[PDB]
């Protein structure tokens, strides 16, 4: 349907496009969304089967989403003024 399968990667990427980021920027971001995508479905298999019972696998997905959102402030608070 969209560059990504879930609406979280789709909404994040398109969001970046709305931020008017430059091309190189949407390129590194898209790379992080694709890696976070395969990691979100593969992990979705984990959580669904009870693999991230420790919160480590699903945790890596959280840090990655914060890394992208941290590189594009697409959904993170970094402004101190």
PDB file of C-alpha atoms in Angstrom:
ATOM      1  CA  UNK A   1       0.000   0.000   0.000  1.00  0.00           C
ATOM      2  CA  UNK A   2       2.631   2.579   1.027  1.00  0.00           C
ATOM      3  CA  UNK A   3       6.449   2.741   1.210  1.00  0.00           C
ATOM      4  CA  UNK A   4       5.982   0.739   4.425  1.00  0.00           C
ATOM      5  CA  UNK A   5       3.448  -1.914   5.566  1.00  0.00           C
ATOM      6  CA  UNK A   6       2.188  -0.551   8.907  1.00  0.00           C
ATOM      7  CA  UNK A   7       0.742   2.948   9.344  1.00  0.00           C
ATOM      8  CA  UNK A   8       3.517   3.866  11.813  1.00  0.00           C
ATOM      9  CA  UNK A   9       6.312   3.674   9.214  1.00  0.00           C
ATOM     10  CA  UNK A  10       4.022   5.099   6.545  1.00  0.00           C
ATOM     11  CA  UNK A  11       2.983   8.028   8.769  1.00  0.00           C
ATOM     12  CA  UNK A  12       6.595   8.622   9.892  1.00  0.00           C
ATOM     13  CA  UNK A  13       8.059   8.682   6.376  1.00  0.00           C
ATOM     14  CA  UNK A  14       5.286  10.803   4.832  1.00  0.00           C
ATOM     15  CA  UNK A  15       5.579  13.054   7.892  1.00  0.00           C
ATOM     16  CA  UNK A  16       9.246  13.612   7.019  1.00  0.00           C
ATOM     17  CA  UNK A  17       8.152  14.547   3.481  1.00  0.00           C
ATOM     18  CA  UNK A  18       5.855  17.162   5.051  1.00  0.00           C
ATOM     19  CA  UNK A  19       8.816  18.533   7.043  1.00  0.00           C
ATOM     20  CA  UNK A  20      10.330  19.432   3.635  1.00  0.00           C
ATOM     21  CA  UNK A  21      13.570  17.636   4.613  1.00  0.00           C
ATOM     22  CA  UNK A  22      16.156  17.600   1.823  1.00  0.00           C
ATOM     23  CA  UNK A  23      16.629  14.507  -0.356  1.00  0.00           C
ATOM     24  CA  UNK A  24      19.718  13.100   1.412  1.00  0.00           C
ATOM     25  CA  UNK A  25      17.697  13.512   4.610  1.00  0.00           C
ATOM     26  CA  UNK A  26      14.666  11.583   3.354  1.00  0.00           C
ATOM     27  CA  UNK A  27      17.138   8.989   2.042  1.00  0.00           C
ATOM     28  CA  UNK A  28      18.820   8.238   5.381  1.00  0.00           C
ATOM     29  CA  UNK A  29      15.410   8.442   7.066  1.00  0.00           C
ATOM     30  CA  UNK A  30      13.822   6.062   4.539  1.00  0.00           C
ATOM     31  CA  UNK A  31      16.717   3.667   5.191  1.00  0.00           C
ATOM     32  CA  UNK A  32      15.977   3.763   8.935  1.00  0.00           C
ATOM     33  CA  UNK A  33      12.252   3.201   8.274  1.00  0.00           C
ATOM     34  CA  UNK A  34      12.931   0.174   6.107  1.00  0.00           C
ATOM     35  CA  UNK A  35      15.263  -1.344   8.704  1.00  0.00           C
ATOM     36  CA  UNK A  36      12.755  -0.456  11.438  1.00  0.00           C
ATOM     37  CA  UNK A  37      10.076  -2.016   9.206  1.00  0.00           C
ATOM     38  CA  UNK A  38      11.696  -5.452   8.817  1.00  0.00           C
ATOM     39  CA  UNK A  39      12.504  -5.181  12.538  1.00  0.00           C
ATOM     40  CA  UNK A  40       8.880  -4.281  13.375  1.00  0.00           C
ATOM     41  CA  UNK A  41       7.335  -7.226  11.494  1.00  0.00           C
ATOM     42  CA  UNK A  42      10.014  -9.712  12.490  1.00  0.00           C
ATOM     43  CA  UNK A  43       9.657  -8.520  16.061  1.00  0.00           C
ATOM     44  CA  UNK A  44       5.884  -8.442  15.658  1.00  0.00           C
ATOM     45  CA  UNK A  45       6.394 -12.172  15.171  1.00  0.00           C
ATOM     46  CA  UNK A  46       8.408 -12.158  18.389  1.00  0.00           C
ATOM     47  CA  UNK A  47       5.918 -10.247  20.587  1.00  0.00           C
ATOM     48  CA  UNK A  48       2.990 -12.152  19.019  1.00  0.00           C
ATOM     49  CA  UNK A  49       4.710 -15.458  19.912  1.00  0.00           C
ATOM     50  CA  UNK A  50       5.949 -14.120  23.279  1.00  0.00           C
ATOM     51  CA  UNK A  51       9.629 -13.537  22.407  1.00  0.00           C
ATOM     52  CA  UNK A  52      10.212 -10.031  23.777  1.00  0.00           C
ATOM     53  CA  UNK A  53       9.089 -11.161  27.260  1.00  0.00           C
ATOM     54  CA  UNK A  54      12.114  -9.181  28.499  1.00  0.00           C
ATOM     55  CA  UNK A  55      11.407  -5.979  26.535  1.00  0.00           C
ATOM     56  CA  UNK A  56      14.806  -6.123  24.794  1.00  0.00           C
ATOM     57  CA  UNK A  57      13.788  -6.932  21.200  1.00  0.00           C
ATOM     58  CA  UNK A  58      10.801  -4.547  21.198  1.00  0.00           C
ATOM     59  CA  UNK A  59      13.056  -2.068  23.035  1.00  0.00           C
ATOM     60  CA  UNK A  60      15.476  -1.853  20.088  1.00  0.00           C
ATOM     61  CA  UNK A  61      12.508  -0.777  17.944  1.00  0.00           C
ATOM     62  CA  UNK A  62      11.759   2.044  20.397  1.00  0.00           C
ATOM     63  CA  UNK A  63      15.358   3.349  20.375  1.00  0.00           C
ATOM     64  CA  UNK A  64      15.430   3.182  16.551  1.00  0.00           C
ATOM     65  CA  UNK A  65      12.165   5.121  16.205  1.00  0.00           C
ATOM     66  CA  UNK A  66      13.553   7.700  18.645  1.00  0.00           C
ATOM     67  CA  UNK A  67      16.800   7.828  16.626  1.00  0.00           C
ATOM     68  CA  UNK A  68      14.958   8.691  13.399  1.00  0.00           C
ATOM     69  CA  UNK A  69      12.557  11.020  15.205  1.00  0.00           C
ATOM     70  CA  UNK A  70      15.710  12.423  16.813  1.00  0.00           C
ATOM     71  CA  UNK A  71      17.366  13.014  13.419  1.00  0.00           C
ATOM     72  CA  UNK A  72      14.212  14.599  11.985  1.00  0.00           C
ATOM     73  CA  UNK A  73      12.330  15.588  15.151  1.00  0.00           C
ATOM     74  CA  UNK A  74       9.416  13.987  13.277  1.00  0.00           C
ATOM     75  CA  UNK A  75       7.769  13.126  16.622  1.00  0.00           C
ATOM     76  CA  UNK A  76      10.153  13.914  19.502  1.00  0.00           C
ATOM     77  CA  UNK A  77      10.647  16.920  21.805  1.00  0.00           C
ATOM     78  CA  UNK A  78      14.196  18.298  21.442  1.00  0.00           C
ATOM     79  CA  UNK A  79      13.459  22.041  21.291  1.00  0.00           C
ATOM     80  CA  UNK A  80      14.616  23.805  24.479  1.00  0.00           C
ATOM     81  CA  UNK A  81      13.035  27.172  23.600  1.00  0.00           C
TER      82      UNK A  81
END
